[PDB]
Amino acid sequence: YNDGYDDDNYDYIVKNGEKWMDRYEIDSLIGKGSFGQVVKAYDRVEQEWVAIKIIKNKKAFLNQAQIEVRLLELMNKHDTEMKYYIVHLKRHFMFRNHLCLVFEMLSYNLYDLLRNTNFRGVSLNLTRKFAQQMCTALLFLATPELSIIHCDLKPENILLCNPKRSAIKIVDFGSSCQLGQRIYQYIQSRFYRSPEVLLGMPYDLAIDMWSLGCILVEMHTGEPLFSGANEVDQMNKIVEVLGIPPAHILDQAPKARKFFEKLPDGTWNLKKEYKPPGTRKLHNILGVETGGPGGRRAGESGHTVADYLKFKDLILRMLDYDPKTRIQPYYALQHSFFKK
Numbered sequence: 001y002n003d004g005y006d007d008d009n010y011d012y013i014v015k016n017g018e019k020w021m022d023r024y025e026i027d028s029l030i031g032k033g034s035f036g037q038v039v040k041a042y043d044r045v046e047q048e049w050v051a052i053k054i055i056k057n058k059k060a061f062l063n064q065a066q067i068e069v070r071l072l073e074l075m076n077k078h079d080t081e082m083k084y085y086i087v088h089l090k091r092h093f094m095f096r097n098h099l100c101l102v103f104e105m106l107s108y109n110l111y112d113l114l115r116n117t118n119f120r121g122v123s124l125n126l127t128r129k130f131a132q133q134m135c136t137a138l139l140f141l142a143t144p145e146l147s148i149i150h151c152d153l154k155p156e157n158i159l160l161c162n163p164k165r166s167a168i169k170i171v172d173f174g175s176s177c178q179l180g181q182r183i184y185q186y187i188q189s190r191f192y193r194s195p196e197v198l199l200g201m202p203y204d205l206a207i208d209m210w211s212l213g214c215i216l217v218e219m220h221t222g223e224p225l226f227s228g229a230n231e232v233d234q235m236n237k238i239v240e241v242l243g244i245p246p247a248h249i250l251d252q253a254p255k256a257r258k259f260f261e262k263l264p265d266g267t268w269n270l271k272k273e274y275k276p277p278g279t280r281k282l283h284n285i286l287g288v289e290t291g292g293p294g295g296r297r298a299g300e301s302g303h304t305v306a307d308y309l310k311f312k313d314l315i316l317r318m319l320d321y322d323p324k325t326r327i328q329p330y331y332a333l334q335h336s337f338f339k340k
């Protein structure tokens with residue numbers, strides 16, 4: 001396979017120390033995904049550290065990464081401070097039959113950060129700083145020329161710039177598309193998958209805002225909001241918190257009958273373990289009146305009942321079952337939660 005440079009997964013077998021095109025020194029493997037791998041490398045020409053995404057030596061992953069290159073170059077074309085919430089692609093090249101995208105070096109992802117909290121979550125103040133950046137990021141992607149749906153927003157795809165600051169960036173546009181399809185695919189990671197994608201419905205940019213509401217509650221509490229074992233468990237866990245989706249959604253939904261039954265009077269309820277619908281109030285999950293999650297924020301600065309109420313309000317508007325009325329990034333940024 002590829003003069004011994006590839007394993008039987010079509011991945012490039014990475015050697016620490018290796019020098020490339022008399023330009024890059026491969027330090028180490030910092031990432032793995034469906035696409036291939038990510039390595040830390042030193043650019044002797046630009047006197048800087050970089051991340052090199054080495055794509056699998058297989059036509060489909062190469063074509064996917066060519067779409068990622070296209071979308072990343074489209075975003076870098078834009079003359080706005082908001083494009084600094086997306087990881088910067090410096091250049092790309094074919095090397096030993098692998099497409100290699102060269103990115104700015106970033107730090108830990110938001111899941112690493114939750115692990116350093118021992119899954120007890122970060123302060124409401126640091127949550128707000130991440131939420132602000134993520135809404136500006138979604139505002140930038142919803143720019144009509146771009147109209148980019150990320151489709152795989154999760155803690156693992158949101159990285160810190162550096163370990164000292166609260167600045168973050170979104171990576172991995174390999175699952176992304178531009179609006180102009182109105183088709184269904186099995187997409188998003190299950191814990192962050194929107195009700196419309198579960199229901200087999202067509203999707204737009206609103207699915208990334210669903211993912212963001214789930215991510216933000218997790219960043220504060222330490223745990224996934226909706227940690228489903230499967231799509232049925234996933235919908236069931238969403239319905240525990242948010243209740244039954246509106247009938248006007250379920251009436252259009254190709255997979256409605258996988259999760260719900262339509263009753264004689266035309267109302268919908270869950271199919272034949274779990275708490276009754278709307279029993280697991282976000283009010284209680286966040287500990288609004290009880291010192292936050294597991295009461296660990298009891299008399300802490302910036303964790304007042306009214307702070308939790310503003311947060312709860314933002315998230316419930318991000319977790320709207322209706323993609324039409326789910327809050328859009330601009331209005332999320334005007335929310336009283338960010339008037340600090």
Ligand SMILES: COc1ccnc2[nH]cc(-c3ccnc(N)n3)c12
Pocket residue numbers: 030031032038051053087103104105106107159171172173
């Ligand atoms: C593990 O991933 C990283 C680690 C550190 N810095 C990084 N800079 C850019 C990436 C990255 C990874 C995957 N896809 C994309 N588009 N970018 C990255």
